[PDB]
Inverse folding.
């Protein structure tokens, strides 16, 4: 739904505006969980190939964890860019059309009469 | 005796002096004297030693009075900060009112036991205080649900005030 926005270069993974955003801290639960998934992938692969589950294929497990963390980092940066630009477009539209989004005044609990439902 | 007679009233005891018109000795008096000399004196000595140790290692604790936050009536709806603070102070006052009711009930039970056969006559002020506090508790916290809240209490009070105002029209 955001593909038609102005300035959308096609098939671009990370445009330069993404460079304005803070990257993931490289030890955050998303990337730690991605590394855990890579480790579990290596363990499951060893068990399916009927090798020792952790004593065998240390290079394979290292490659699995590294690839999962790498791809997860770049995908996470892309998703952060997408959510940030969605919030930016929403705030810009709010500022562009203020008559459709009125700052509605709420009144205190001294004028409104909430009906009371007793629980006898 | 941390408790005080201002909050836990007790009339002064009026015991009559003995008039031993018989010549028999009193086993109650003999047993109380022996009970004092055998049981009460060592227990008193142990408690005095314990109190001396406490006075050596004396420490203090305080009350933590809370101040009045703005209530539910004077801030806008949908503001969860003011609603949270008003709800917490209302729950605090609710618990305090529960213990006020407990104090009045203890006072009533003490009056009934102290007066015994004359409880229908001289417990008039205790029963009157119990009835008035019961009426106020029923006016403020009775029909509120198991999800009782400052908003529900305010709605009940506003409905009651509307009914009283409508009755005061005629
Ligand atoms: C030993 C193993 C861990 C080694 C860690 C080594 C690295 C390190 O130092 O990391 C510190 C690193 C420092 O992070 P931080 O930036 O300081 O913030 C820490 C906060 O606690 C961050 O806390 P938070 O509240 O911001 O959480 C982040 C957010 C996002 O977090 C995530 O996405 C990761 C969630 C991991 C679980 O979490 C959630 O939204 C929680 C979702 C919970 C519901 C999920 C429902 C599905 C079921 C359970 C998950 C699926 C498992 C398999 C299916 C079977 C389930 C029965 O902390 C973590 O990595 C925290 C997670 C550690 C455990 C991972 C899973 C085991
Ligand atoms: C931990 C949980 C995940 C384990 C994954 C690996 C599974 C595995 O291979 O287990 C076997 C292996 C032990 O096997 P073994 O005794 O050596 O020999 C294998 C036999 O030869 C095997 O004999 P066999 O296979 O020739 O014949 C027996 C056969 C006979 O067949 C059967 O018995 C059939 C059984 C059917 C019923 C079960 C169906 C599946 C149930 C799944 C779970 C459902 C309930 C859980 C909650 C809801 C989940 C949706 O199969 C089995 O008995 C099944 C074997 C596997 C059982 C364990 C399954 C684990 C995955 C599912 C549970 C975990 C995820 C959900 C829970 C999450 C937490 C709440 O397990 C482990 O070694 C576990 C890992 C222990 C070390 C963990 C170290 C962590 C280090 C973290 C730091 C380093 C990474 C840092 C990353 C971040 C960097 C930035
Ligand atoms: C391994 C992953 C390798 C990825 C290489 C680069 C891929 C790429 O160019 O992705 C950009 C692509 C198109 O971007 P966009 O113009 O937003 O298209 C709308 C489609 N949702 O973006 C997408 O198609 C979004 C989803 C990408 C999913 C990648 C992992 C599967």
């Amino acid at each position: 739904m955001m593909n038609g926005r102005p300035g959308h270069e096609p098939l671009k993974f990370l445009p330069d505006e993404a460079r304005s955003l803070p990257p993931p801290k490289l030890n955050d639960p998303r990337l730690v969980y991605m590394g855990l998934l890579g480790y579990c992938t290596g363990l499951m692969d060893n068990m399916l190939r009927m090798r020792p589950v952790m004593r065998a294929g240390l290079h394979r497990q290292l490659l699995f964890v590294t690839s999962f963390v790498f791809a997860g980092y770049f995908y996470l940066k892309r998703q952060n860019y997408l959510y940030a630009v969605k919030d930016h477009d929403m705030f810009g539209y709010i500022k562009l059309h203020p008559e459709d989004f009125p700052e509605k005044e709420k009144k205190t609990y001294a004028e409104i009469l909430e009906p009371f439902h007793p629980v006898r | 005796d941390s408790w005080d007679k201002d909050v836990y009233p007790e009339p002064p005891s009026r015991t009559p002096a003995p008039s031993p018109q018989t010549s028999l000795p009193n086993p109650i008096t003999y047993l109380t004297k022996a009970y004092d000399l055998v049981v009460d004196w060592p227990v008193t000595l142990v408690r005095e030693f314990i109190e001396r140790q406490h006075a050596k290692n004396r420490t203090y604790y305080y009350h933590r009075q809370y101040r009045r936050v703005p209530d539910i009536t004077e801030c806008k709806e949908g503001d969860v900060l003011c609603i949270y603070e008003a709800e917490m102070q209302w729950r605090r006052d609710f618990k305090v009112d529960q213990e006020i009711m407990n104090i009045i009930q203890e006072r009533l039970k003490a009056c009934q036991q102290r007066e015994g056969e004359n409880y229908q006559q001289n417990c008039a002020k205790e029963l009157e205080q119990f009835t008035k506090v019961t009426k106020a508790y029923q006016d403020r916290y009775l029909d509120l649900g198991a999800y009782y809240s400052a908003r529900k209490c305010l709605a009940k009070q506003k409905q009651r005030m509307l009914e009283e105002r409508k009755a005061a029209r005629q």
